[PDB]
From a paper:
The FERM domain protein talin (∼270 kDa) plays a key role in activation of the integrin family of cell adhesion receptors and also provides a direct link between the cytoplasmic tail of the β-integrin subunit and the actin cytoskeleton. Talin consists of a ∼50 kDa N-terminal head and an elongated 220 kDa rod composed of amphipathic helical bundles. The talin head contains a FERM domain which is similar to that found in ERM proteins, although it has two novel features: the F1 domain includes a 30 residue unstructured loop and is preceded by an additional domain (F0) which, like F1, has a ubiquitin-like fold (Goult et al., 2010). The integrin binding site is located in the F3 domain and, although a second integrin binding site exists within the talin rod (Gingras et al., 2009), only constructs containing the F3 domain are able to activate integrins (Calderwood et al., 2002).
We also established that the talin head contains an additional globular domain F0 at the N terminus that is closely associated with the F1 domain (Goult et al., 2010). Based on these results, we extended the FERM domain construct to include F0 (residues 1–400) and removed the unstructured F1 loop (residues 139–168), as illustrated in Figure 1A. Overall, the model contains 358 residues and 561 solvent molecules with an average B factor of 18 Å2 (overall) and 25 Å2, respectively. One molecule was observed within the asymmetric unit and is shown in Figure 1B. The structure of TH′ consists of four domains arranged in a novel linear configuration. Both F0 and F1 domains have ubiquitin-like folds, the F2 domain contains a core 4-helix bundle equivalent to that found in acyl-CoA-binding protein, and the F3 domain has a phosphotyrosine binding domain (PTB) fold. The interfaces F0-F1 and F2-F3 each form a network of close contacts that stabilize the relative domain orientations. In contrast, despite a similar buried surface area of 620 Å2, the F1-F2 interface is loosely packed with no specific interactions apart from a single hydrogen bond between the carbonyl of Q288 and the guanidinium group of R194. The F1-F2 linker region in talin (residues 196–208) adopts a distinctly different β-hairpin-like conformation in the F198-S205 region. The packing of the linker region against F2 positions the F1 domain on the opposite surface of F2 relative to F3. The location of all the membrane-binding residues on the same face of the talin head indicates that they can all simultaneously associate with the membrane, thus generating high affinity binding through multiple dispersed interactions.
Numbering used by the authors: 2 to 133, 173 to 398
């Protein structure tokens, strides 16, 4: 009724007899009394390990369990193996530190050990991330992480303001979809540079961190990532440099950065109309974007989205629509009406009237 188990240590294999109820912690002691190789380091740096052809499936025995918890049988082998191994962690400043960690611990337990060595007490404001997602309640080993891999130390993201809250993913996703769709469909006009910035975050959100082997030329369908007017361009390299610049940023940080970026623009929350300006004495017309808000009218370059002129709504003296044009009269504020060619004049006139009313 004794269990006869082969103990492997280095190149030694010695069969020892154990009662099936022997606690692992006592079994380790027993081994340390009999094989000098077992004394290579302190007891807490070693344990018993059952290997598997799949390295992911080898398991460390728990000190406080009995051997028979593990269903051990006569002729099985247990390895008395060092738990401590060196793990490369990327710090926040980009440098890489090599820290001794216990292979039998969960990611969470290691992270606590890691933080304490570098002087961080709030270990739960951090997570570890892999270099090509880790459950922090499982071990690195069982998740297929190989010992030569570097992990990154990443601070959990928190941001909130009057507009967005990183703690409420549902609401955040509503605001992100709205801002993104308005940008993709041209409702919110943006420069090419800003479109490509937005699309970098979009890539981060849809694909995760940039992967140079997979996220290569011709990977994106640019019609899904840029306003139409920018598809006829070399946008992909610009988008991927923005994507890359996101590093290991979480999906929620990326959404928050997208929404804040959209709200920072002069053009955000403005109702836009695509109109044309007549050029005196010439046939050409010049496209322009005309924007209206509760506080102002803006004249915006159709290409660059620069605001080239702006007026307060309180400066309008009168305004007039016809079936082909729309005209603003600013009276003594400036010399000359602003008139534009458009078939949407009634609708512009109506938006203005509504704002002036209040």
């Amino acid at each position: 009724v004794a269990l006869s188990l082969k103990i492997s240590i280095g190149n030694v294999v010695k069969t020892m007899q154990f009662e099936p109820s022997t606690m692992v912690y006592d079994a380790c002691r027993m081994i340390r009394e009999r094989i000098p190789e077992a004394l290579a380091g302190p007891p807490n740096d070693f344990g018993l390990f059952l290997s598997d052809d799949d390295p992911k499936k080898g398991i460390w025995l728990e000190a406080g369990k009995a051997l028979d918890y593990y269903m051990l049988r006569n002729g099985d082998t247990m390895e008395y193996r060092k738990k401590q191994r060196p793990l490369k962690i990327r710090m926040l400043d980009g440098t890489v530190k090599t820290i001794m960690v216990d292979d039998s611990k969960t990611v969470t337990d290691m992270l606590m050990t890691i933080c304490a060595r570098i002087g961080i007490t709030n270990h739960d404001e951090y997570s570890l991330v892999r270099e090509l997602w880790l459950d922090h309640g499982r071990t690195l080993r069982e998740q297929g992480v190989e010992e030569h891999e570097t992990l990154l130390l990443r601070r959990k993201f928190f941001y909130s303001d009057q507009n967005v809250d990183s703690r409420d993913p549902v609401q955040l996703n509503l605001l992100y979809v709205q801002a993104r769709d308005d940008i993709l469909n041209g409702s919110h006009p943006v420069s090419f540079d800003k479109a490509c910035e937005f699309a970098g975050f979009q890539c981060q959100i849809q694909f995760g961190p940039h992967n140079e082997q997979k996220h290569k030329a011709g990977f994106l369908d640019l019609k899904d990532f840029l306003p139409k007017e920018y598809v006829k361009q070399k946008g992909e390299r610009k988008i991927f440099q923005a994507h890359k610049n996101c590093g290991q940023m979480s999906e929620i940080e990326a959404k928050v950065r997208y929404v804040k970026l959209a709200r920072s623009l002069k053009t955000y929350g403005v109702s836009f109309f695509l109109v044309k300006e007549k050029m005196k004495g010439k046939n050409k017309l010049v496209p322009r974007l005309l924007g209206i808000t509760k506080e102002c009218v803006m004249r915006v370059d159709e290409k660059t989205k620069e605001v080239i002129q702006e007026w307060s709504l309180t400066n309008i003296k009168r305004w007039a629509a016809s079936p082909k044009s729309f005209t603003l009269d600013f009276g003594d504020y400036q010399d000359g009406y602003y008139s534009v060619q458009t078939t949407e004049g009634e609708q512009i006139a109506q938006l203005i009237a509504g704002y002036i009313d209040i």
